[PDB]
Design a binder for this molecule. Structure first.
Ligand SMILES: Nc1ncnc2c1ncn2[C@@H]1O[C@H](COP(=O)(O)OP(=O)(O)OP(=O)(O)O)[C@@H](O)[C@H]1O
Lengths: 523, 137, 259, 88
C-alpha cells in the first residue's frame, strides 16, 4: 500500500519510437553509477558506450533521428496537438524549446497548464476553480450551469466530473459522430473518446471525464479488452446525472434556464429510455389553461386535479394561442378543467410512450369517445338531442360518406357549429401533418396508422338547428349537400388537415365574395 | 422464441396479445399483454409451484399458432368458464379443428395438428419446429 | 498480466444483445427480472445453509456438553457410548453443511459480476453555478479601457493578419480572439484606416479591408442572431462563394473612396 | 412547412430565418376591379377593410401558408355563412 501508481505493465512501449525514428539514442545517468550512451537502429542489435559529453547530473535524453516521411513531428503545431490530446494531465510540467523571429530565442512552458482537479476532494474545490477547469476542457467562452463530482469504490474504481453547459451548442441536434463530450482516462493517461458507449445519445450534451486506476487494456492502450465494463460505467453515469437534475429542479430560476435550453432531450429519452421514463416524466413542464404565463410540472396538475377527474387532458398543435383558441377546448374550459398545451413536433413522440402519469391516463382532447364526467341533467339533454338529430346526422353521412367514418352530435363544443376528431388508434391530425413532412420516411405504409375522421355537430348552435329545418323539407336537396361539404372543409381546415384540393375552397370563397360585392351573375 | 429459449428464459402465459404486429412484414414479442388465460394443465394445478419448463411455452405457442390458423378464440362456442377450466386442467379437452382454415395446405395444417398432439408430450422442439415451418415454406 | 477477473459480466439494458424478432424494450425488463429472482433463490440458499449449520453446531455442542458431564463420575456407559454415535451422525450431517458452506462461497465466486456487485459509492457532491454578476459602464470608460489595452492587440493583429484575405492567419488569430470576446471592435481598425487617409500605404489599409469585412460581417450576423462571435466561428470562411470575392472588392472601393 | 415539422427544430434560429411575403393582384379580375371601384368611391370604407383581409387569408391557403389563427378565419367564414343561411 505505498502511494504511487504508474503506467508500467506491458514492457513493449519504448520500441514504438521506431514508428517514427530510423535510429534512437539514449543518454542516461543514474545515481550510484556513471553515464552511458545506448544506440540502436532496431536492427536486431544495439551497443552500449560510456559517454563523455556535457554533464547531465541526473536524467535521460531520448534522441530520435527521424525518417523523412515523419518530418512534421518537428513542428510546434503537431507537438501542441498531440500533448494536448493525450498527455495534458501528466503531473510534472512539460516544456518546449524553439527560436524567436529581439531576434534569437524563446523557451515555452505549460503545455499542461491545467491540473486534473477530479483527483482533489470535492470539499476543497471552489465553484470558481471548477469553472476555470471547464473552460479549458471544452474550449468554451462561458461558465457551466451545474456540476457533479462523484466516485465509485470496490472492483470497478473511478472518479468522475460532469458539467451541464449553460447554452446548447449550435451543432447539438446534428450527427458529426465525434462523440467527444466524455473522455475516458486510465491513471491520468487518455484512452478514448466516448464513442456513444459511456453516455446515451440524448444525454450527449454533458461534458466530463471519467478516471479509473486500472482496466483491462488492449496492447496498443487505445481500447478495453472487456467491452461490457463500459456499460457498467454508463449505468452509474446515467443514474447520477438524473439525480443532478432533481437537485437542479429545487432551484426554480436555474431550472427554467436549464429546461428552456435542453427540454427536447428529456422528451427524446422518454421515446427511447424504457427504464428511466418514470423519473424523466417528473422533470417535464408545460403551459396550461391555468397559469398561461409560466410552465407547471405534471405532478402539480394532479395536485390541483379535481377529485372527479380520471385522466390528464392534453391537446397538441402548431402554437400556444392556436391551441388555446381551438374548437375542441371550450367545454373543458367552461367546466373548470385544466388543459395541457403541447406545442412542439417532439411532443407527439413522447406522448406516444407516456401513456399515463402517477397512475392517471393521458387523454387527448382531439380524439373520439372523449369522456368528461356527466351530470344527469346533462345526460337527459344528450339523449333527447341524439333522438331529434338522428335524420340530420344520417343524411349528412349519406352525402359525405366517402370522407368521414362516423357522424354524431358533439359533446365538447360551445360557440362553434362543428368539429372533426380522429379514431382512438392512429395519427391524430397533427401527427399526420408531421409524418407527411419527413424527408426520409416511406409514408406508403401509413394505411394501418392513419386514423379515420369522425365528424361531430353542435346541437345547440343556430347553423345546425337551421340545417335540420333545411334538410327536413328535402333530404335530396343539393343546397344542403353543398353545405355539408363546405362546412366539412371549413371544419377540416380548423382541425389541421390540409385541403388535398385547396383551389375548390378558394373558388367557393371567391364565389362568396361575388355575393358580398353584388356581382354573382357578372351584372 | 428460438433465440429466446436458448437463454433459459421463460415467461408464463405466452399468448396472441403479448405479441405486436407493426408496419411492414413485422411481428414481435412483448410483455404488456375473469381475464383470458391460455395454459398447459401443469401450470393450472396447485401441484408444483414453479411449472417453469420450456414445453409449457411450446404448447402455448401451439395455442397461439391455432389462433393464427382459426382467427377466433379457441373454445369460443364450446364452453363457459367452469367447463374450459375443469376439462383442460383434467387433460380432457381439445379446441375444435372446425375453425382452423382449409386455405392452409396439408404441410402446415398437419404440423398445427401435431401442435395439438404436443399436449400429450414433453418435447422442447423449438429449433426443429422452426426448421420444419421454414422448410415447409 | 491476468485479466480473468473481468471474463464474465451480466448486463441487463444491453443493446448489443437484442434479438430482432423481440420487442427490445420488453426484453430488458424481462432479463432484469430473471437476474433478481436468481439472486433471491441464492440468498434463500444462504438462509437454509445457515439453518443447517446452526442446527449441527448447536446439536454437536449440546452433545459435547453432555459428553463432558458424562465423563465426570463415569459409570453406566450407555449415554457416553450413544453420544459417540450421536456426535458421529451430527458431524456427518455437519460435514454436508460444510460442503454446502464451501459450495455457497464457491458459487458466489463463480456467478458473473453485475452492476451492484462491481461497485459501491464513494463521495458525491452536486453544485449549481449561481450566476455571474451583471453590470453597466459608460461608453467612454469602456472604449478607453478597450483602446488603452488594445494598443498592443491591434498592432499584433495587423502584423499577424499580414497575409491578405485567406486562411493562414486564422490559425494564429482565432485563439487570440478569446481576449477579444469582450471587443466592441468595430471602431478601432476603421479609426485606423481613418488615421492617415491622406497619405497611407496600400498594404496596411488593404489589411483593414480584410479585418473589417470579416469581423463586420460577423457582427452583422451577431445582431441578426443570438450568437457570440467566438461561438459562431470562421469555419464559414472555407466557402468558395462569389459573395466573398465580388462584394469584398466592391466595398473596398466604397469605403476607401468616400472618406 | 418542412422546417416547422422537424422533431429537432432548433426553433429560435428558424424563427429568424423564415422569409417574408409579397401579395400579387390580377388587374383584369372582377374582384380587383370591384374592390378598386369600392376603394375609389370611399378609401376609408370598413367594408373594403373587412374585404382585403378575407381576400388575403384565402391567398395564404392557396400558396401553402398556414393561418396564424385558423379559428378566426372560420369565424369570419361563419359570419358570412349566417348570411348564406339567413340566420342573423
Ligand atoms: N526515461 C526512463 N527513465 C527510466 N527508466 C526508463 C526510462 N525509459 C524507459 N525506462 C525503462 O524501460 C522500461 C521499458 O519501458 P516501456 O515503455 O517500453 O515499458 P513500460 O513503460 O514498462 O510499459 P509500457 O509499454 O506500458 O509503457 C521501463 O519499464 C523502465 O524500466
Amino acid at each position: 500500500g505505498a502511494d504511487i501508481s504508474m503506467i508500467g505493465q506491458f514492457g513493449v512501449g519504448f520500441y514504438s519510437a521506431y514508428l517514427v525514428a530510423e535510429k534512437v539514442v539514449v543518454i542516461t545517468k543514474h545515481n550510484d553509477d556513471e553515464q552511458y550512451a545506448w544506440e540502436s537502429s532496431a536492427g536486431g542489435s544495439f551497443t552500449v558506450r560510456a559517454d563523455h559529453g556535457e554533464p547531465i547530473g541526473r536524467g535521460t535524453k531520448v534522441i530520435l533521428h527521424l525518417k523523412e516521411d515523419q518530418t512534421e513531428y518537428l513542428e510546434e503545431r503537431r507537438v501542441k496537438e498531440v500533448v494536448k490530446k493525450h498527455s495534458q494531465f501528466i503531473g510534472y510540467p512539460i516544456t518546449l524549446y524553439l527560436e524567436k523571429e529581439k531576434e534569437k530565442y524563446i523557451d515555452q512552458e505549460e503545455l499542461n497548464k491545467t491540473k486534473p482537479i477530479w483527483t482533489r476532494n470535492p470539499d476543497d474545490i471552489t465553484q470558481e476553480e471548477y469553472g476555470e477547469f471547464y473552460k479549458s476542457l471544452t474550449n468554451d467562452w462561458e461558465d457551466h450551469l451545474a456540476v457533479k463530482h462523484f466516485s465509485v469504490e470496490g472492483q470497478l474504481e473511478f472518479r468522475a466530473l460532469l458539467f451541464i453547459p449553460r447554452r446548447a451548442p449550435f451543432d447539438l441536434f446534428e450527427n458529426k459522430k465525434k462523440k467527444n463530450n466524455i473522455k475516458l482516462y486510465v491513471r491520468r493517461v487518455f484512452i478514448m473518446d466516448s464513442c456513444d458507449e459511456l453516455i446515451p445519445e440524448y444525454l450527449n450534451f454533458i461534458r466530463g471525464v471519467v478516471d479509473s486506476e486500472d482496466l483491462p487494456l488492449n496492447i496498443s492502450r487505445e481500447m478495453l479488452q472487456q467491452s461490457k465494463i463500459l456499460k457498467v460505467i454508463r449505468k452509474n453515469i446515467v443514474k447520477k446525472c438524473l439525480e443532478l437534475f432533481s437537485e437542479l429542479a429545487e432551484d426554480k430560476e436555474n431550472y427554467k434556464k436549464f429546461y428552456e435550453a435542453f427540454s427536447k432531450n428529456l422528451k427524446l429519452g422518454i421515446h427511447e429510455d424504457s427504464t428511466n421514463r418514470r423519473r424523466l416524466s417528473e422533470l417535464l413542464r408545460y403551459h396550461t389553461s391555468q397559469s398561461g404565463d409560466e410552465m407547471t410540472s405534471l405532478s402539480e396538475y394532479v395536485s390541483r386535479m379535481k377529485e372527479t377527474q380520471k385522466s390528464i387532458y392534453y391537446i397538441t398543435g402548431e402554437s400556444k394561442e392556436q391551441v388555446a383558441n381551438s374548437a375542441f377546448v371550450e367545454r373543458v374550459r367552461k367546466r373548470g378543467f385544466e388543459v395541457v398545451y403541447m406545442t412542439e413536433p417532439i411532443d407527439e413522440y413522447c406522448v406516444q410512450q407516456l401513456k399515463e402519469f402517477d397512475g392517471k391516463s393521458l387523454v387527448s382532447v382531439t380524439k373520439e369517445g372523449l369522456e368528461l364526467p356527466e351530470d344527469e341533467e346533462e345526460k337527459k339533454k344528450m339523449e333527447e338531442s341524439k333522438a331529434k338529430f338522428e335524420n340530420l346526422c344520417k343524411l349528412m353521412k349519406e352525402i359525405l360518406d366517402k370522407k368521414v367514418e362516423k357522424v354524431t352530435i358533439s359533446n365538447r363544443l360551445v360557440s362553434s357549429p362543428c368539429c372533426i376528431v380522429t379514431s382512438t388508434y392512429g395519427w391524430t391530425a397533427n401527427m399526420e401533418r408531421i409524418m407527411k413532412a419527413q424527408a426520409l420516411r416511406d409514408n406508403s405504409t401509413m394505411g394501418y396508422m392513419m386514423a379515420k375522421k369522425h365528424l361531430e355537430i353542435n346541437p345547440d348552435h343556430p347553423i345546425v338547428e337551421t340545417l335540420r329545418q333545411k334538410a327536413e323539407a328535402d333530404k335530396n336537396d343539393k343546397a344542403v349537400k353543398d353545405l355539408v361539404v363546405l362546412l366539412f372543409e371549413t371544419a377540416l381546415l380548423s382541425s389541421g388537415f390540409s385541403l388535398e384540393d385547396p383551389q375548390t375552397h378558394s373558388n367557393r370563397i371567391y364565389r362568396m365574395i361575388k355575393l358580398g360585392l353584388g356581382i354573382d351573375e357578372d351584372e | 422464441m428460438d433465440y429466446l429459449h436458448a437463454k433459459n428464459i421463460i415467461h408464463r402465459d405466452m399468448k396472441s396479445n403479448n405479441i405486436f404486429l407493426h408496419e411492414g412484414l413485422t411481428v414481435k414479442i412483448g410483455d404488456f399483454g375473469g381475464s383470458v388465460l391460455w395454459m398447459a394443465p401443469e401450470v393450472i394445478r396447485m401441484q408444483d409451484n414453479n411449472p417453469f419448463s420450456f414445453q409449457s411455452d411450446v404448447y402455448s405457442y401451439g395455442i397461439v399458432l391455432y389462433e393464427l390458423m382459426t382467427g377466433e378464440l379457441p373454445y369460443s362456442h364450446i364452453n363457459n368458464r367452469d367447463q374450459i377450466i375443469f376439462m383442460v386442467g383434467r387433460g380432457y379437452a381439445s379446441p375444435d379443428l372446425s375453425k382452423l382454415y382449409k386455405n392452409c395446405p396439408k404441410a402446415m395444417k398437419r404440423l398445427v395438428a401435431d401442435c395439438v398432439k404436443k399436449v400429450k408430450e414433453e418435447r422442447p422442439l423449438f429449433p426443429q419446429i422452426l426448421s420444419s415451418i421454414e422448410l415447409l415454406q | 498480466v491476468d485479466y480473468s477477473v473481468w471474463d464474465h459480466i451480466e448486463v441487463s439494458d444491453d443493446e448489443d444483445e437484442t434479438h430482432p424478432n423481440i420487442d427490445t424494450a420488453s426484453l430488458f425488463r424481462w432479463r432484469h427480472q430473471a437476474r433478481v429472482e436468481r439472486m433471491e433463490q441464492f440468498q434463500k440458499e444462504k438462509e437454509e445453509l445457515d439453518r443447517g449449520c446452526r442446527e449441527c453446531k448447536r446439536k454437536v455442542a449440546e452433545c459435547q456438553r453432555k459428553l463432558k458431564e458424562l465423563e465426570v463420575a463415569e459409570g453406566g456407559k450407555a449415554e457416553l457410548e450413544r453420544l459417540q454415535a450421536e456426535a458421529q451422525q451430527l458431524r456427518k450431517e455437519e460435514r454436508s453443511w460444510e460442503q454446502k458452506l464451501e459450495e455457497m462461497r464457491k458459487k458466489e465466486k463463480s456467478m458473473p459480476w453485475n452492476v451492484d456487485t462491481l461497485s459501491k459509492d464513494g463521495f458525491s457532491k452536486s453544485m449549481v453555478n449561481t450566476k455571474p454578476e451583471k453590470t453597466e459602464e459608460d461608453s467612454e470608460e469602456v472604449r478607453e479601457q478597450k483602446h488603452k489595452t488594445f494598443v498592443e492587440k491591434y498592432e499584433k493583429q495587423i502584423k499577424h493578419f499580414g497575409m491578405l484575405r485567406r486562411w493562414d492567419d486564422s490559425q494564429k488569430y482565432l485563439s487570440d480572439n478569446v481576449h477579444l470576446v469582450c471587443e466592441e471592435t468595430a471602431n478601432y481598425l476603421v479609426i485606423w484606416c481613418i488615421d492617415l487617409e491622406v497619405e497611407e500605404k496600400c498594404a496596411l489599409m488593404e489589411q483593414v479591408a480584410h479585418q473589417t469585412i470579416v469581423m463586420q460581417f460577423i457582427l452583422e450576423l451577431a445582431k441578426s442572431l443570438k450568437v457570440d462571435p467566438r461561438a459562431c466561428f470562421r469555419q464559414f470562411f472555407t466557402k468558395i462563394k462569389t459573395a466573398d470575392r465580388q462584394y469584398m472588392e466592391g466595398f473596398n472601393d466604397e469605403l476607401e473612396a468616400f472618406k
